[model samples]
Target: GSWEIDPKDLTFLKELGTGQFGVVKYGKWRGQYDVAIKMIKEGSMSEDEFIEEAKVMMNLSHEKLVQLYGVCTKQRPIFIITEYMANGCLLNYLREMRHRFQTQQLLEMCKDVCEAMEYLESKQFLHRDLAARNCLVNDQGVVKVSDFGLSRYVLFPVRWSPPEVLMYSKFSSKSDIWAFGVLMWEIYSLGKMPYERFTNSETAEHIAQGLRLYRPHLASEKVYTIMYSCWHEKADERPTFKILLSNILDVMDEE
Candidate 1:
């Protein structure tokens, strides 16, 4: 099938972002709208895998969710078009305003992110790669969940018989809740990577030992309590997305 990217309509502007699967390009089409074109690298994944991911990305749409406008698979390199976020990712914004984000600003970002996450969970999708770096924030500070390459459907349980259960945890809504806890830490700490001092293998060990990054100086007492609630070693012990949403709302009310 022929994809409809009009050659005369727009010009490829510049590369906006890159990931394991592909790189995103910033471009202007129809003289007004700014958009991102995700140039998917076929070598990075099998054709079947790419198609599966495309399907998932195309189906998801929420106010806090990045909208997938269209797809282009006609050429040798396949890609998809989506709405562009000019303010860049949350990490960059946090870094730029590290010293300026007051407690209230930090809390508002948390609340916004939780709402976005809750929307995704409501649709039965798990963002396996939810991290500070992947979350995009606009000029208005509204957060939009992005980087759907690593996302997966969590409706059916996959038998994950890895060397350790928690090491290679299977995708689930609860798993995203865990990532949300890390993201909370990242935001509170002014964009530091979760367990920044710890290596990947060390993180795996900590997970096996039922140890989580303890919240200390950055977030409020209530935020610390919420992090612990999400970091429960037993996946089933962790709070659901609905519970997390309500818990954050409670904190906002108390503030």
Candidate 2:
């Protein structure tokens, strides 16, 4: 397939990130295309399954989603290729540039994420994990959803997770709606940790008790309503990404 990149054509540069997920390095494909390469630390996890999941993500082509350009599997170390996000993680970007963004700009950022989620929902693909930390902002300020295949078994965020995932291990587009609410709160809160006051264990307790994150001073009451709706006790009661996206667009165009 066109997505199978020859290992020889890729050049690894400075390391970008490292963790149980793997080592991410800034690299170039064919010495021209700026790309991010995740060098899988062999044997740390199941390679065969990871590569198989990566292929599915490859076909989920959408500008709002991180593009899985290709994979390098024939060599000693495998490389999962993706487009370079210049501004880095959206969570860090939101905090670092807090004073620079107007409230309207933040709303626009929210819209970008909603649009991306809408596309994923339409494709019947669940992000599994959707939050400010799992997103990236390019040099142009456009936000794109990142991180795939490495989901499911990883440590899920307590605050970003809904009650269903906490209790029944139920994950669906509706559960994703719950995380989206927390993410909206994160963006408006200038990247503040969701439920900064509680431990993960405590967060689980309160979430099951119907607790919800409060509105950020940066968010208008209407915006708060959108975020609040996402935290509805019943997952089915939460608005779909399509509805939320349309809701966001109306607010954005409201002048």
Candidate 3:
């Protein structure tokens, strides 16, 4: 509760990101770990809603999940303090670097991601917005899932649900499986934006029509088949995260 930063001491280093909520600033806190403070403006949502969700995320602990260190709620604007990922996000890193990952490297990343997914699923939480942009990797090559803005609690009841809810919120763990398949593609493709070849409307149409993006040319035959299995028209057809983890490992063995 005591995570307030002295506004005078905090110097804005650079804009880490901006999204529907607000901008995240990379800054120093007591001259320690590089921290990113997400500043949420008033009227974005009720203060109660913001604090409730923030507290839940702050309480979640997993090795593959990014740590939400603290929050500042002393004033009108709410600031969420999180560990600054030095390497930035996977999307930005891949966009700047040109090298493709080797099989072992890919396998290692895949294993870590699956571990994260399993950890989240075990807690009955859904990372509804899993993408290359949201997954951050450090210089040591360890991956941690970040950006919990879209994270959903599995037990919440819906009064009136949107169609995305049909696919995204029907169950907690299953929805993550779908995201996990896309994430696998993200990892192998080196942070290429999902459906980059398609327009926003096209992506919506494909999701409605149960059409998943095609596997890339560089995708190994076994891996391609595995990804295809996860993106089936029926969400039920997708493998469970536990099964998915085992299957990916088995495929690596064949490779």
Candidate 4:
């Protein structure tokens, strides 16, 4: 059940980061429990819309996804309290440990995300934005998928996005799979930015013209092949998250 946390009970600490919808803060609830508070500014989204989104999040319960603890709706800036991730964003974490992390470690992170995506697919939800930067890691090294309720205007990072999403604003499981492929590149490359040489428009053009990033130097051929399959021009040709998860687990076992 959702709790209407008293604003007085929540104490703000330091700013963690800001999202398209609002600012996220490292804070405490009731002066005891550590939490990450997502404060959505007033007027950003309608009350009904916020309620619906909150309901969607409430219904979702998965180990790999961030847990929405509660919400403060009656307050001015709506507060969303979720479990705090001590290690922070996956992208920066991987970058800091670049080349220091083993290939097995990278593959484990990929598998963690693949399992999350498979869960989302099973739930009939489209993550829309699936990238290394969007994921969070706890102190225990568990990756938790997040940032689910952003509007289309906030969907940047075109390099990880699919051509169909770029061309027609179309979003589906297939498009997410394409984004997952780019995320795999990020993992294997130790968080290297995709399409480093191309402008956004140029990157889209290149992808539309059948171009895709080459396999990262450290990625095994089998893993690269799976990533390549995700970038197929025909959305229908892309493997489902279930298949991807199974294949990734097989790769892990082989390694």
Candidates' C-alpha lDDT:
0.71, 0.85, 0.69, 0.84
Candidate 2: segments with Cα more than 4 A from true spot = 97-99, 153-155
Model 3: lDDT equals: 0.69
- Report backbone clashes per prediction: 0, 0, 0, 0
- Candidate 2 local lDDT, 1-255, one digit each (tens): 666888788888888888566788998888788999888776666667766777787888778888888888887577778999988998989898645889898888888888888888888888887889889999899999887436742436778889999999888899889988999999999999998989999999998888778889989888999999999998899999999998888777773
Candidate 2 has what TM-score?
Answer: 0.95
lDDT of 4 at 166: 87
Candidate that beats the other on lDDT, 1 or 4, i.e. the better one: 4
Error of 2 at 180 (Å): 0.7
Best by lDDT: 2
Q: Give the range of the ten consecutive residues with the poorest summed lDDT in model 2.
A: 148-157
lDDT against true structure, model 1: 0.71
Tell me the TM-score of model 3.
Answer: 0.81
Which candidate comes out best when scored by TM-score?
2
Over 1-255, each residue of candidate 4 has an lDDT whose tens digit, in order, gives 355667788899999988766799999888898899988876666655666577677777888887788788886777878889998999999889533988898888888888888988988887888898888999899888886554532327689777788889878899889999999999888888898888998998998898999999989999999888899988999999999998898998999
TM-score of each: 0.86, 0.95, 0.81, 0.93
Residue pair clashes in candidate 2:
none
Segments of candidate 3 deviating more than 4 angstroms? 2-12, 149-171, 207-210
Residue-by-residue lDDT tens digits, candidate 3, 86-164: 7878767656655556766766677777877877777777777766667788768787888654433211211111225
After superposition, which runs of candidate 4 have C-alpha atoms over 4 Å from their true positions?
A: 1-3, 152-155
Tell me the lDDT of model 4 at 49.
64
For model 4 the TM-score comes to: 0.93
